[PDB]
Design a binder for this molecule. Structure first.
Ligand SMILES: [Zn+2]
Length: 7
């Protein structure tokens, strides 16, 4: 799957 981190 694809992963996105928005700090
Ligand atoms: Zn993946």
């Amino acid at each position: 799957g694809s992963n996105q981190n928005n700090f």
